[PDB]
Design a protein around this ligand. Sequence first.
Ligand code: HEM
Ligand code: HEM
Ligand code: HEM
Ligand code: HEM
Ligand code: FES
Lengths: 147, 62, 51, 378, 378, 241, 48, 81
Amino acid sequence: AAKNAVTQFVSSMSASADVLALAKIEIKLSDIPEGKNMAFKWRGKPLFVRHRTQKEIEQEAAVELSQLRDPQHDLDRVKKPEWVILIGVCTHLGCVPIANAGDFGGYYCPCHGSHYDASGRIRLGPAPLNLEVPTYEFTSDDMVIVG
Amino acid sequence: AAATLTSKLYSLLFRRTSTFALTIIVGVMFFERAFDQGADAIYDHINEGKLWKHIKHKYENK
Amino acid sequence: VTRFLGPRYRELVKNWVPTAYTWGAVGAVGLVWATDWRLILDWVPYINGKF
Amino acid sequence: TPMRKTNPLMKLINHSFIDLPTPSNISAWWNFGSLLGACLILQITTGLFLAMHYSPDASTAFSSIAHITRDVNYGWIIRYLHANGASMFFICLFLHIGRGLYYGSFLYSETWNIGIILLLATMATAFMGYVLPWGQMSFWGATVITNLLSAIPYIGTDLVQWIWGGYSVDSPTLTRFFTFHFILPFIIAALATLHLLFLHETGSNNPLGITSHSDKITFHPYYTIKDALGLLLFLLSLMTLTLFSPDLLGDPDNYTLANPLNTPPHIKPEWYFLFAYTILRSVPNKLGGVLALLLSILILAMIPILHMSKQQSMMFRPLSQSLYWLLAADLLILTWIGGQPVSYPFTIIGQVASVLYFTTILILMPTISLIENKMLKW
Amino acid sequence: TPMRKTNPLMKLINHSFIDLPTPSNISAWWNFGSLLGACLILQITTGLFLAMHYSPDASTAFSSIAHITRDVNYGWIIRYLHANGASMFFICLFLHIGRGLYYGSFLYSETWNIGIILLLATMATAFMGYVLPWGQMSFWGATVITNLLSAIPYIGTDLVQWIWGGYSVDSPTLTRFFTFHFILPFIIAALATLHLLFLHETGSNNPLGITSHSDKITFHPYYTIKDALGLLLFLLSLMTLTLFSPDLLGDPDNYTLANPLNTPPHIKPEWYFLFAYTILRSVPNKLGGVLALLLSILILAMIPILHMSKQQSMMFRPLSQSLYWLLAADLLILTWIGGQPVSYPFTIIGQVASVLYFTTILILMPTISLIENKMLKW
Amino acid sequence: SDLELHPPSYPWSHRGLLSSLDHTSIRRGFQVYKQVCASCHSMDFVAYRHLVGVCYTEDEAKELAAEVEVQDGPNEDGEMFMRPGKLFDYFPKPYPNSEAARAANNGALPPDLSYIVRARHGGEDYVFSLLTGYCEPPTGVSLREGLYFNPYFPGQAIAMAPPIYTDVLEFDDGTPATMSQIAKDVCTFLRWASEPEHDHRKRMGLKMLMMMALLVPLVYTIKRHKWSVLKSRKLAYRPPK
Amino acid sequence: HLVGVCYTEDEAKELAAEVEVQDGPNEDGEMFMRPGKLFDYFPKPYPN
Amino acid sequence: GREFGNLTRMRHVISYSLSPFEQRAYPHVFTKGIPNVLRRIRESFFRVVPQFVVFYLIYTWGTEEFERSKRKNPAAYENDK
Ligand code: HEM
Ligand code: HEM
Ligand code: HEM
Ligand code: HEM
Ligand code: FES
């Protein structure tokens, strides 16, 4: 009985039915067109998702490992290159970058001109490190868990 | 003059308090599972056709 | 510290060895049950109400 | 030389627990005091988890309660073990005072007075805590009971506004009560340590009332398991009360969110304060019911002075026993009257029950104590 | 037959305060210990009046403090006395521990260990309390500190989310931290009672290190006014820190709202934690930095074992005294390094300062103690 | 005036000390709530989840949550676009604010149903009888046409129009749609709405009765085992005289 | 706030009126604008 | 202070006591146990019960009279005619 007491109180602290509900969930269709972006709310953070053309995968992979302001091998990042999924917040002062914009074909921040490549890595502008890559995994071919 | 089972049981498990606490813990190990599934089976038995887990048949496994 | 080693202390530690392994079994099994550790509990023959 | 008698910490555990002598002939009632300590230990920890989720604001409080009852894991069990645990705390407390009134344990006057102080602190604690749910009953219970302070002649309203933190009960007041209700029990624990501190230097009383030094017993082997049986029976009553009919002892129409605009039709205090409420509602004039409310709890200090019997224990004095159970029945009368809407049949019985409640503890008891003193040729 | 000797409460006060012998030659440093005893009261009382307005929701925790500093009458003085009061608390604390390390007071090993546990308690209290205001540094500090728990190899993230109450720091974490912050200091008080309990059966140490039984003196006539003067100087320095330069021990950015999205530059934790934080900055490995962190405070427990000199106080042993002030200078070095962004000059000095911090008291001190032994021909 | 009639007790399935709520009734009662109730009654504290483990399957809950659009936070600019809806969303507000609800109901405010059962005295028993009963007004008493005479209502003149009658709604279960069955399913669903924990609480009450009945005799025997030395002792007195 | 530091209370009551803010809902209505009073905070330039 | 080593003096009062394991935890339960509880109840009964019985009569009366006080609404209109 004592365990059924003790762990029970511990169970009160572990989480909550709503916090578990508001978070993690973000099942989404794979219907998104290549090169087309769609923002999505997730744990309060903006979160863009964009299918991308193979040529963009080529120009992203072509980028030198050393040239990057915040170097990070591309194939090592995304699990499947054709899809990119990113937090919508720029790493500088937190302004949200415009979807599918900038010279490098990734994202562009209106606030101070920060640029991004299709892989979401920082390439130009004040912002230090690369756009965050949330952990996630595909389930059904049309759907994806985000978290 | 036949030996009682307790005469050997005490000679083995209960003679030392460490083995005593040990057999108590293993006893909790089995008792938790057995008693829990038993009480669950009973409470499931009193109210057949009420609990939704039994109502799942209208829509489960395709 | 050097004094603790000796001819009779070996005998004493040897006398308390079975008690040491037994309470070690107590702490181990007690931890496995208190935590509902899944890894060993998958292996136990009857305690499988976990799904 | 046992390790317990050498270690300065263990000496306290050794004297206060393991080896203090107790009368051999102690009965079930003496368990309740220990139970109170356990109840406190339960009222703290359980309530502490509620503190992890409750948000003390005029708007968010009730919604936070729904959050506890639903979205929080196992939260409703905590809320009900807590809310019913308080009522259990008052059952054990009233019985605990009652045995003292019976067996003449009040002769330990300093411990008696400290116990009274624990009683008042417990009342302020439970009262400030009942406001936290911020249900329909809570806002108006706090409203009326704090409006009682209006009565004091010069301080009157200025004092009431100083408690409210404003011109009416509102969020700042709810936060006030959240803090005070959070802090008082921890004072109650220290005062309880003082309580036992004035108790243990004289020794526990026995039901016969005769000194029992001839047959003292070490506390551990016997009373640890006896008190353990008491803890188990206590958990029996509490767990049944919460897991089978949690709300029978609670008040329906508390769940509706508080409306300053609207007054609930019956509006009554929860039962453990409630007998005292009659002493308010029965007495004419706003101030006299307040003074009667004070005397109702403060007499207890006056009681040891009023003792006249040459004995101690009630068991050898049946004529006093009749008045004692008569008084208990009078208390039940006060509770049932306080559970009811104003009307002449109730108010009359309230007048009679109140006046009888004071006459039995002031006038009647000492006189029959004298008569019993003369029946035995003293 | 004085009454102090009769009534048990007056007995205990006669022990702990009025009559217990102390060495006559006790200096100004021991006073700091009593000052800590004072500070806690302030940190309660003052803090008790901040809890009456503070709302532990993430959406309103900041605006409520704006409500305290602005809307509430005389709220800002309570705010600043509280915040600066914690700083004075840790200053007296560090001086106290340094006093105990210098005069060989660690030989009272049980009292020493209770002091260590009480230290960890005060640290957790100050941390969660600093998390309460819900500014930039508060929110970010919580995220950074909490992740360290994630370091533990197997349990890690499940445990970390168990502290968070969610995926990320948010309102429930804030409410939880408000509860633990509310509850811990009183536990610190009970520990303090244990602390003084173990302390008094041997008696306070004296600066010479020689036993002072020949020159014991009652506490009341002298040390009460000595501690009155020390408490007065304490209130002086505290009020000067609050009414003239409230901010300088603090850090701007807390006055900004927390942003889960945006990240602040300097990201420096409040100053008393800084040196420990440098150690995290010093070891490249995560779990290694965590263990070095826990060793940074546990290490105090190993000091009595490492003692080698046949004397207590450093005052008769100048070499070890010089090592001691090297240690203090090193702590100033880490404490300053914690305020600085990582760069070539800082990272190298931080690592050297940490390694020196461990090596000076795990190696050099016992050895030079042995040298001091051989120099004095025994 | 005179106190309201006291409702009769009913032989409900869940009033047994160990018996549980019937989930099919909760389903059908929710299906009553979605139409006749939802138009003019909020349920502030119930999400489209909760239903996931009690009646509707998670996928069916996903399909159900999307059937009504919900307000959401700003996109570009403010503009406040409305989402199709998700599981964590709560039941939709019939009105933006209480004052509008009063305007739609001659000043009367329809109470939240999230705790309507455990609030009223007599509990859900107050509810069924409130719905089942609409006697024609007594001779010698008169009231406003907007008011309606329901004797079980304490004011004895409820502003609510008689919400239900036979075949107001057609159950998917195919069960007959008598107003009695409707009100029954409503009271069952509201009872669940106010006590989500009921089914688990009965289950833990059983388990505690078994553990407690198992434990009391044992601890008592331990106490008898310790106290037996005292109960069995036989002191004697042997003066030198 | 300003009433004790600079403006006299009448001056603050005049100055507060010059800018207006929305109020609580009308009966069978909503969100009408109000002239404003001393207890009002300085106006927020954007809804969000 | 009042430790077992120093309390009341007492002189040759011999006593006897078996080991717990040497004797049953439930000696003669039916022959002596139940009748004892019954004698105890018979002793407490008349002392305790009647006041409570008195309480009940008052409780019944109060509710009933209140019923006459209110539910006999028709008596007042009947007075009206
Ligand atoms: C939180 C509240 C309380 C706690 C924790 C507490 C605790 C205790 C404990 C453990 C005892 C030991 C004897 C026993 O357990 O029966 C005791 C004795 C006593 N208490 Fe309490 N008590 C409380 C409230 C009260 C109250 C309200 C009163 C009086 C109105 C009181 C008066 C007494 C008296 C007179 C004794 C002496 C009993 C004897 O000598 O046998 N206490 N208390
Ligand atoms: C003797 C001590 C205490 C008593 C008698 C007591 C009693 C109560 C009561 C009667 C309520 C009302 C609950 C309800 O009606 O639903 C309550 C609520 C609450 N209490 Fe306590 N309490 C005590 C101590 C504590 C302590 C020590 C804490 C925290 C450490 C605490 C925290 C809370 C909280 C957060 C609530 C609100 C939850 C709710 O209202 O359901 N209480 N308490
Ligand atoms: C040794 C004991 C304590 C220490 C060292 C301590 C220290 C602190 C610190 C450092 C802060 C951060 C404030 C800031 O930086 O602005 C704080 C805030 C706070 N403390 Fe304490 N505290 C202690 C005990 C207490 C107690 C007993 C209470 C009881 C109510 C309390 C209530 C609060 C509250 C409510 C806040 C946040 C409110 C605000 O900051 O405006 N603290 N404390
Ligand atoms: C709020 C925190 C603390 C309080 C209230 C406190 C309280 C006290 C008090 C009142 C004394 C009496 C002697 C004196 O004041 O010098 C004392 C002595 C002592 N304290 Fe503390 N203490 C605290 C923290 C600590 C810590 C953190 C340590 C060690 C790391 C410690 C170790 C000691 C030792 C070893 C003594 C013995 C003094 C001697 O031997 O002369 N204390 N403490
Ligand atoms: S905020 Fe992202 S670049 Fe300035």
